[PDB]
Amino acid sequence: GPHMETELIEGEVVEIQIDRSITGGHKQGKLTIKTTDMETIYELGNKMIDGLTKEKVLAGDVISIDKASGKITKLGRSFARSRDYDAMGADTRFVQCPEGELQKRKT
């Protein structure tokens, strides 16, 4: 596999269908993602809803879905309100929330 051999799907979100009628036992939905070649539709399970909710996924965001773990990860291309302001001198808002320092990239 590329990087890893886990079944992963990622792409920019074209469309989002999330149930609002299903009981809090097993939510469902239908996601439309733009891949490298085309937009494909993927079925959302309860854990998928969970993951996309956690990542705060909306149309226009990009995310990856782990078929094995059921975890969803927003990649970073198609985002929303990313801080482009790094000239933080009078900006005492150093709210760099530790969301998982995966690999010591480090600024």
Within the chain, residue ranges assigned H as helices are: 46-55
Q: How many domains does the chain have?
A: 1
**Rg of the Cα trace of the chain?**
16
Residue 72 phi, psi dihedral angles, 5° rounding: -110, 135
DSSP string, 54-71: HHT--BTBEEEEETTT--
Residue 91 phi, psi dihedral angles, 5° rounding: -95, 90
CB 62, CB 11: distance < 8 Å:
yes
Using DSSP, state whether 31 is helix, strand or coil: strand
How long is the chain? 107
What type of residue is 80?
Answer: A
CA distances from 85 to 22, 71, 75, 90, 94 (A): 41, 30, 20, 11, 11
Which domain range does residue 58 map to?
1-107
- What are residue 61's DSSP bridge partners? 59
Q: What whole-number distance in Å separates Cα of residue 51 and Cα of residue 63?
A: 10
Centre a 10 Å sphere on the Cβ of residue 24 and count the other Cβ atoms it contains: 6
CB 34, CB 15: distance < 8 Å:
no
With a CB cutoff of 8 Å and minimum separation 6, the contacts of 99 are none
